Amino acid sequence: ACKMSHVRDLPPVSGSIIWAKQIDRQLTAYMKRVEDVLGKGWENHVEGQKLKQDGDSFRMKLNTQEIFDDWARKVQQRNLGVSGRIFTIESTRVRGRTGNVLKLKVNFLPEIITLSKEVRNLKWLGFRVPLAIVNKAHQANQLYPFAISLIESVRTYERTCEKVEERNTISLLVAGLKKEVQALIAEGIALVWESYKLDPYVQRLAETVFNFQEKVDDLLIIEEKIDLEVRSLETCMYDHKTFSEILNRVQKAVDDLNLHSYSNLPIWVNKLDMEIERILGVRLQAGLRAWTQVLLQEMFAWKMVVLSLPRIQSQRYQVGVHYELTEEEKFYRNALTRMPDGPVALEESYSAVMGIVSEVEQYVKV
């Protein structure tokens, strides 16, 4: 029942105390049923006091002030921040990981039972609670739903952050988005003791933990997909199309990384060049095997035939990466924004090189 209360934003612990009160009222109702078994006078004194004795015996603190005094004592001691988590805006919040996945969030769901207890004891009907429950209510009006949503989004942020943490380069690239989140947090926590901008930092903390989850899945998709395309070589290869797709993937990877929230070329060029290099490397290994399988007195042609076609397709040994795999260069321009062209001459350079290699290989004497 308290689980339904937590599944419905209600008093969990205060509802448990009131639940005890209701079941004890059901015991009193059972005593009234035995009273209904009798008339309406004084002919019901045999075991009625014993009935109330058993009902109050297993429920000695059901509807009494003992639960109210317990909530009041808990509030007076320390139950003021659970229902009053106002520090989830720009305050004490230990966030981070191995890659520094830091943001602004809370964990109000842990002490949510004490939170709901103090909140219901201070706002339902005004139960016995000290001024600390009122402080919890004021800080609740400050950042209550923000702390609850921040706890939920923090849980989802850590869950998506684990998948993003599967690759360390994804954390290095996600740092570029964490810088934007920290920039918004710096803009919201930039004024020297702003007495009127706490709700923006609380709403930004909730949206920041949600952005950590969504950005964790997105940055993991970008970096891990670059690693996946880099390690994906079981579809089609053994031509210039594999390395061409790798180079175009590097260009599109730099553009897609530029479409995100970052400002330094490092993670973008790293994912782009890494995807192109390892994609062309794995596809080049398979292509090397298939390339050896497909493109590996006039009577003195034995001299040329001794080593005629040993290298019919040797125009693809670019130090495994080179970032500009092409056996020639392209044209020029004056001024624009085209900082993602890896190998612009990769459409005819190595093509003419390998074609002349195969032609001179099979025709080393003609």
Binding site: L102, E180, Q182, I189, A190
Partner: peptide
């Protein structure tokens, strides 16, 4: 979260 975090920490002091 490095330069922006350091700026926010310096502003907090």
């Amino acid at each position: 979260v490095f330069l922006m975090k350091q700026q926010s920490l310096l502003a907090k002091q």
